[PDB]
């Protein structure tokens, strides 16, 4: 049987604008004002894209509930018998990986965690940074695990957790993973299309200060074989609709982590 997962591309849009006197001051102060401004919008948007993907991942991934120790949706890790606190999480990382391998058939090629969840996992040992192996960390990973997955940090979502999941590209069309982002630029005239999205400038008709903004469009869809536990069996599946798709996916698995609070 062949089914399809369909979504429309949705949009993001930012606006800045810099008063002429302020723009002139940026040059006076040592900044490249016109490039500063484009870099600002591009940076803020890229940041929001990253947040969207990570937050979407949290809400799409399946929950690793186990009758033994995780039927809360998270694992409670103390400071007593210190190596155990990290190693009992490593075990969950490995079990979540196996769960994916069995249920989706995909290998679960990455691990992402909150800053503290990443640290407690690193604390187990069995993790290495090893600059010599940086070649396979995309200069992004915290470090990597003995089980072969790179460990990346989130730092943005208010959750404290660990997610394992898959990113695979066999070739031409056989592209698989938990969330596809999949930006849409066709028809948009771009200077270096790798940029994605475009800038627009208007300039106010009353005040004559400039105005600038940036538009980005993309699908951020769910993977095939995932059907919300409502329809269960469907032929055309909304690959978006997080209100129904959330928490139901076999290409990623989430386990939260319960830690003592940081004193502020």
């Amino acid at each position: 049987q062949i089914n399809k997962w369909q979504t429309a591309v949705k949009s993001r849009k930012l606006k800045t604008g810099i008063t002429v006197e302020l723009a002139q001051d940026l040059e006076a102060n040592g900044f490249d004002a016109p490039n500063f401004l484009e870099d600002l919008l591009a940076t803020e948007m890229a940041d929001e894209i990253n947040k969207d993907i990570l937050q979407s991942l949290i809400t799409v991934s399946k929950r690793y509930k186990v009758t033994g120790i995780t039927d809360s949706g998270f694992i409670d890790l103390s400071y007593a018998s210190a190596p155990e606190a990290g190693r009992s999480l490593y075990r969950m990382v490995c079990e979540m990986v196996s769960h994916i391998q069995k249920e989706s058939t995909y290998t679960a090629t990455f691990c992402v965690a909150s800053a503290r969840a990443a640290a407690i996992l690193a604390a187990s040992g069995w993790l290495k940074h090893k600059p010599e192996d940086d070649k396979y960390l995309s200069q992004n990973a915290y470090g990597f695990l003995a089980n072969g997955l790179p460990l990346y940090c989130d730092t943005n979502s208010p959750l404290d957790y660990v997610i394992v999941g898959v990113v695979e590209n066999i070739g031409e069309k056989e592209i698989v993973g938990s969330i596809f982002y999949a930006p849409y630029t066709e028809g948009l005239d771009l200077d270096d299309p790798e940029h994605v999205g475009a800038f627009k400038v208007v300039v106010d008709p009353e005040s004559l200060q400039p105005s600038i903004g940036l538009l980005v469009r993309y699908a951020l869809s769910a993977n095939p074989y995932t059907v919300a536990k409502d329809e269960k069996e469907a032929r055309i599946i909304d690959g978006g609709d997080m209100d129904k798709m959330a928490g139901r996916s076999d290409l990623s698995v989430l386990l939260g982590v319960k830690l003592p609070k940081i004193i502020i």
Binding site: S11, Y184, E186, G187, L188, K200, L215, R217
Partner: protein
């Protein structure tokens, strides 16, 4: 005496049309405005002939 019209189209539409149909989504629209105005003027002349 004057005579004028506006189009006011979105960015997102213009991009979608170029991707989906191949239409410029600027020229095909400005073309309507210009056509409508010239057509209405041509009618005005015929109508004044029949009026008078």
């Amino acid at each position: 005496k004057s005579r004028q019209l506006k189009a006011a189209y979105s960015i997102e539409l213009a991009q979608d049309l170029r991707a989906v149909h191949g239409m410029d989504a600027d020229a095909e629209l400005s073309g309507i405005l210009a056509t409508e105005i010239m057509l209405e003027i041509n009618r005005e002349v015929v109508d004044w002939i029949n009026y008078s």
